[PDB]
Symmetry: D2
Subunit: 122 residues, 4 copies
C-alpha cells in the first residue's frame, strides 16, 4: 500500500498530513496542525508495515513531528500510532501521544493522549 498511503491526508481538526511511503517502509513528509502552538509545516518521519497481512487487516504505521520549525518552537513532539485501511473511503485511524519538555516537578503532566482520523477528502 505504498500507493495507498502516499499523498495528502486531512484529519477532523482540519490538519494536513503530507506523506510519502518508501518501498523500504519509510514515511517522510510534512505536517501542518490546525490547532495548538503551531504555524506552517513541520518535518515528519516514520515507518509502516510494507508487507501487510492479506486477510483484510489494516496496515500498521506511525510517525513523529517535533514542533520546531523556522517560525516557532513548542518544545514538544507528537507521535501518531495507527493503521491504514484502504478502499473507497480510505482512512488512517490513529491514537497519539504529545510530550512536552518539562521540569522533573511537572513531568507527571508532560503527555497528552488523543485520537485523529485521517481521510483523503476535506
Amino acid at each position: 500500500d505504498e500507493a495507498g498511503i502516499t499523498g495528502t491526508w486531512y484529519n477532523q481538526l482540519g490538519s494536513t498530513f503530507i506523506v510519502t511511503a518508501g518501498a523500504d517502509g519509510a514515511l517522510t513528509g510534512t505536517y501542518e496542525s490546525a490547532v495548538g502552538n503551531a504555524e506552517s509545516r513541520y518535518v515528519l518521519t516514520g515507518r509502516y508495515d510494507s508487507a501487510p497481512a492479506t486477510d483484510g487487516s489494516g496496515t500498521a504505521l506511525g510517525w513523529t513531528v517535533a514542533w520546531k520549525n523556522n517560525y516557532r518552537n513548542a518544545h514538544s513532539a507528537t507521535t501518531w500510532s495507527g493503521q491504514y485501511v484502504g478502499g473507497a473511503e480510505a482512512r488512517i485511524n490513529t491514537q497519539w501521544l504529545l510530550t512536552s519538555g518539562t521540569t522533573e516537578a511537572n513531568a507527571w503532566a508532560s503527555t497528552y493522549v488523543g485520537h485523529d482520523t485521517f481521510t483523503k477528502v476535506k
Copy 2:
C-alpha cells in the same frame, strides 16, 4: 543535546535503542526488543527538539519502529513519545503506543499503551 541523545540506550525490559541525533532534529537508528514478536534489529526513525528550553526542562522527542525486518513481520508499529533528561544519570522517559493491523471488527483492541525508561547503562 545532539551529543547527549546519540548513542546506545537500554530500557527496563533489556531492549536496545541505538540512535543518532542529527543537527536538523532527525533521529535514525535501530531497535532490538527483548520481548514480543521480535528478533534482531528493526529500523527506527523519529524527531527531537534540536533547540530545547534552557530552564532545566527536558528535550521532547519521539520515534517509530514498524515490526518488519528480514526475519519476522509482526504487522504492528510502536511509537515512543517522551523527553530526554541530561546529566550524570541521563534518561529518556517515554510512553508508547503499539498498534497492530486488525480487521474492522477487532480495531477497538488494536492498540497497547505502555511506558519505557531508557538509560545509558545496562
Copy 3:
C-alpha cells in the same frame, strides 16, 4: 448536569452504558459491551464533577468496569475518562484503558487504549 448524565447511553460499537449521577458526584450503573470477552451487564462505578464550569466547558467524569459477572470473568478492567457535553446532540467523549491481569513477563502488554463516543440515540 445530574439530569443530563443520568440515563442510557450507547457508543459506536453498540455497547450500552446505563448510569445514575448522584447529587454528591457518584456514578453508578451497568455496562453491556457489544464486543470482547463479555456477556450481559457488569457493575460500574465512577465519579463526575458535580459543579462544572459555566463557560461552555464540558463536565469531567470517569468510570470503571471489572469484567466479572455471574456469566464470565475476563480478568480485566476498563476505565473510561472523559467529558459530558450537553445540548441537542449530547455526548460523552471518552478515552479508555483496558488492563488485564498478567504475569510479570507479559505485563508490558497488559493494557489497551482506545476511545468511545456515547450518545443518547442508537
Copy 4:
C-alpha cells in the same frame, strides 16, 4: 485479594491512595494527590476482579477520582487502570487518564496520560 488490596498505598509522587476492597468487587476510599490542583482528600470509587486467575497473574482493577472536594474544584477527573501484584513487595501498577472539562475548541488537549506505581511503604 480483598485483604491484599485494602489499605493505604503510596505512589512515586508521594500521593496517598486509601482503599477498601468489597467482597463484591467494589473499591471505595479517598485519594490525596501530592501534585497538581489538589488539596486534601477526594472521594474515589472503582472495581476489581474479585476472582482472579490462580496462575500467578495480577489482579485487574481501576478507580476514578473527580477533582472536586470542599476546598477546590479542578474540573477534571482521573481514572487509573492497572493490576495488583501480591507478595513481599506488593504493588499496584497503573496507567492513568486525566480528563479536564474543556471547550469544543480545546477538546483535542483535554486528556493527560501517565503511569503510577503504588506500594504499601513510603
